[PDB]
Structure 1
């Protein structure tokens, strides 16, 4: 089973200068709950962004660098390797990977950040004609989590 996992804002910004443009603890917890015990797949730049692999799940990095050999990371070198990985695989980032996968994945777990940020990376446009809302749940706001946001689970129609 193959899912996208992503947070994008009202204009589908996902990234600025190789970071997330927002501080949102609730979203990162969301990620941890979903992906813990399973597999992440991510592109090189995204890994450099997180910098080490996430504990307690199988971290996998897509890169062309056949020199790449990082402790605690599986490495793959084509897209087509993804379909070999067993279990629940999450496509984790970033823009290049989403672009390449969005047409391929079963479903997407999207956090809509209900704001407009400055970005330099974007999620590809998509249509609800194509995507059934299996659930939609407002994140809770609070002293520490102050941007409105919604957890969407979308499943490919038809």
Structure 2
């Protein structure tokens, strides 16, 4: 399986100055539970922002840098390399990788952050006409998670004769 994994706000902002614009622990827990035991594919900037590999999953970084080498990280240099990765692969970010892959993935795990943040990087536009809502689950709010958010699992609709 090839999936997108992303959090975007009401205007599809995903980032600001190489950071997440929001503080939302529950979304990072969501990410953890979905991706443990599987594979994350991320662009170089997204990796440098996180700074280290995330434990208990395969960490794959796409970069043109032939000198790139980080302990605990596998490196690829082409989009085509993604299709040779075994198992359930999650496209993890950032904007560049989402743009390159949104037309190629089977499904998307999207956290909709129900707010409007300042951003400098965006998830590409998409329409629910093309995507079936396999599930939509409201995140629970509390002391440490104060921004309303919704977990969407979207599956690409098949084109059929009407």
SS in 2 for 1:129: coil
**Residue 116 of structure 1: CA displacement?**
0.2
Q: What per-residue deviation string (whole Å, max 9, x for no partner) do you get for residues 36-87 of structure 1?
A: 1000000000000000000000000000000001101000000000000000
Where does the alignment leave 5 or more consecutive residues of structure 2 unmatched?
none
Aligned residue pairs: how many? 158
For residues 100-145 of structure 1, what are the alpha-carbon distances to aligned partners after superposition, in whole Å with 9 as ceiling and x for unaligned?
0000000000000000000000000000110000000000000110
Q: Secondary structure at the match of 1:87?
A: coil
State the Cα distance separating 1:92 from its structure 2 match.
Answer: 0.2
TM, length-normalised to structure 1: 1.00
Equivalence for 2:36: 36
1:154 is paired with a residue whose SS is strand
What's the CA shift for 1:149? 0.2
Tell me how large the CA RMSD over aligned residues is.
0.3
Distance 1:54 1:30 in 2: 14
| Runs of 4+ deviating beyond 2 Å | none
TM-score, normalization by structure 2 = 0.97
CA distance in 2, matches of 1:157, 1:36: 27
Structure 1: state its 5+ residue gaps: none
Q: Matched residues in 1 for 2:119 and 2:69: separation?
A: 30
Paired position in structure 1 for 2:59: 59
Q: Distance in 2 between matches of 1:40 and 1:122?
A: 19
CA–CA separation in structure 2 for the residues paired with 1:127 and 1:32: 27
